[PDB]
Write a protein that binds this ligand. Structure first.
Ligand SMILES: [Ca+2]
Ligand SMILES: [Ca+2]
Ligand SMILES: [Ca+2]
Ligand SMILES: [Ca+2]
Lengths: 219, 218, 219, 218, 218
């Protein structure tokens, strides 16, 4: 996952988490505007190992952390499927749940037989039980750090998003929280690209000087 | 119940099953138009035993028997509410259902706590369990004779509908099936009125001549 | 457009309007049940000149005339497009409508310029004017004859329906009204198949005796 | 207007443009959390000149400038209602619009009568004409400097919002652009409050030290 | 603010103090009738700077200066609510008031327990303390010149009233008192409109001739 712009000499590769610091406010604002307008503008080009350019639908742009909606139909559906798989991995728990559902179905079936009208039903499944329970992620009481962590956790659930990008999101988190975000990103394998006007101390990042020189920085 | 139109001299009473034949095509088509437009048109009237006019919401008009869906939002709502009332009439059974739902919620809650992502849940309700089970009336109908029987069952189940009316629905059923439908209507006590362009032989019916005079038959 | 059942020796062709009378109540009710269940049952087979069997989605079945909804999104959309074409066929009327729309757009544009906020717009078209007018067919005060006539008029608007079929719809209409329906069906070129238990006098129809013998009948 | 939190000794007043710098990352992130949760949390308070608490509906919180859509049900509804009121203030212009709409309705009605299919219509209204024209605020923004200006225009247009708050939005704009934004805020009289993790040189701002003491700068 | 009637060619604006003289007795009496009947009659209209019609509830019409009571149920309600809001703006003072009220309630409760008859009480509230104290505007007026000043003070205090109108109230005040009333109106910024049958010498006023033409004076 390499990204390239006219200011860079060679296309820079983005693997796991990547912190890109732009010291020039003009090039930073122009780069962010090229991030929002990416489908319209040909200046900023992001391509994969196949050199194929990714569509704006495949690109995930995030600026406001608390304003973004983490709960979607596809995210909640795939999450319910993941919970159903977790319950399916254990035979004993699945057997017990099947027993309880069998009892409830017996009770409701008796209540249906007591009625005068002829009634028919099918089954009460686990996905229908999770949908009836209303399982969803809670962003209401979550701190910004837990919100970004939940976004990194649900990025694997999003199928269509090729790369996640954050705009000036590193100013809220402490250095230790940034270390936890990067260390978790290395395990999640997702491609995250952070854009900050000022450099963060203690973390590896790519610095773009006002001279338009891109250099790697350990601190 | 009685129905009154400006063509009849006096309002005729409809009790249990009733077969009404209209020998005039213009009066029959205009009568069906008055049935669908009953809310708009004041010509056709219906007076019950209380001698009170009834709204079109209380009149059930069914022309196509096979095209009438037995499962509807209001029917499923009243059925689910009825089952919820039956389950609410027994405290012990509902208590056991609350215990089982509590166990399932504890298991799914433990599995949610085992996940690395934060999860928020509300609760599970008996109505959500009935809707999740998909409780509905039987949709299996082999012939129109059985479908009309299901329409009579759902009609007798609905308290709001005071009358059920069929338009030219007797042409599909055989004379013996018409006898079984009349006997089932007399056993169910529901009020059913049929409208046919031509007379049917072998059964009692009210024949409306082209002269507009109404005469009983059999 | 030929239809075939086990009772018939050869498939009967349906061209323009066709009146099919079944004197047996058992075969008539079984044929209607095979009309509603057509996708499930293989007994009744309707095929075109290509011998390809038409899907139930391509088949249009109609029993209740006044209960059917003639107003649909596709029917109203294609009807608005037809009205737009009728207005486009006349250059003078289109020019006058363009003039009036130009005047209204001038007034609204002046009102927008009077406001403090910067406002932008595009155009007011003819399709948007028809959609704002709410043009639709009125079945409320229509008689059953006018309802069936409007159904024969909107059958050309329906793209997916291959053939229209009516179940016992000829009992309401007088002989003259049936002659008008057939004479209009010959001009509309649509394929309509009527199913009646009793034969109609004065019109050409295919009669099926209780002996299960199919014969053409002039009266 | 003034804002008050447990960290401050006394509530600080926000008049015209205001720049607030928080030198503590925990107090800044917790402050933004208190901004999004303001409805839920009672810690952060806002007291106007009337010394009355304001609901979260009256507070406009905008973090992403480019990601904030200008067009919305309340913005287009209030705008279309405003244009309808402006057209209603002049009887003659509205009368001419009614005449032209009557002519167009007569033409389309004649074309409908020319068709062989029955057609039913209701009427055409000025609101349907504005919605049909697609009246909306200009969506063209070349840079974030212009987009923030449009946000200030729509904010000054909205009477319900008593305050506009930007979180870390000053990092995109140059110092000169910040001066132009402050001058435009002083000319527009609107109340704008900015929250920055680090201090900005050359402009007047309130610096909150890690010791929690607040001191003015420039 | 502007007022418009069928007699005027164009609506005249009323800003700060305004003196309107009507040289026709029929147009003056019919104008006052249109003032009292303004809710019933649509002839007389009033358009503010927003060009929006105002209800009669927003128009304050005062003819008799001495006969107008300054203390009213709505005025005392808004005043008591205003004092309650001022006391609610300070938590410490309201806390001390709650402490003193708790002490008095403890003393009176002890005296009630000392009695042989059972006694039930609820509580004491700040609103009941203000109403018990009888807080009201000053009712002392030596002359109509001071009473009109109190009417201007209460009018400037009331936000709902957008205009104050006096009918033939300038005949009581001397020319110097009229100058002081105009200067006080310009200092208070309130909109006041006077209606006089005859012109007043020495002050600027709008003269409406019997020909219906309106001309400025001084
Ligand atoms: Ca639930
Ligand atoms: Ca199910
Ligand atoms: Ca309309
Ligand atoms: Ca448009």
């Amino acid at each position: 996952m390499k990204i390239n712009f006219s200011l860079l000499d060679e296309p820079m590769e983005v693997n796991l988490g990547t912190v890109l610091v732009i010291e020039d406010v003009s090039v930073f604002a122009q780069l962010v505007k090229e991030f929002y307008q990416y489908d319209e503008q040909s200046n900023l080009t992001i391509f994969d190992s196949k050199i194929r350019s990714i569509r704006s639908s495949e690109l995930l742009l995030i600026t406001d952390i608390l304003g973004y909606d983490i709960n979607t139909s596809q995210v909640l559906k795939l999450l319910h499927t993941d919970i159903v798989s977790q319950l399916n991995d254990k035979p004993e728990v699945r057997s017990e749940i099947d027993s309880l559902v069998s009892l409830i179905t017996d009770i409701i079936m008796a209540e249906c037989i007591e009625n005068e009208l002829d009634i028919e039903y099918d089954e009460i499944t686990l996905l229908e039980l999770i949908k009836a329970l209303g399982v969803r992620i809670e962003t209401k009481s979550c701190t910004v750090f837990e919100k970004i962590f939940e976004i990194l956790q649900i990025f694997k659930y999003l199928v269509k998003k090729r790369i996640l990008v954050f705009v000036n999101s590193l100013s809220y988190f402490s250095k230790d929280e940034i270390y936890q975000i990067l260390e978790y990103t290395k395990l999640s394998q997702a491609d995250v690209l952070f854009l900050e006007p000022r450099q963060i101390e203690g973390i590896q990042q790519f610095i773009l000087d006002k001279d338009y020189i891109l250099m790697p920085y350990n601190n």
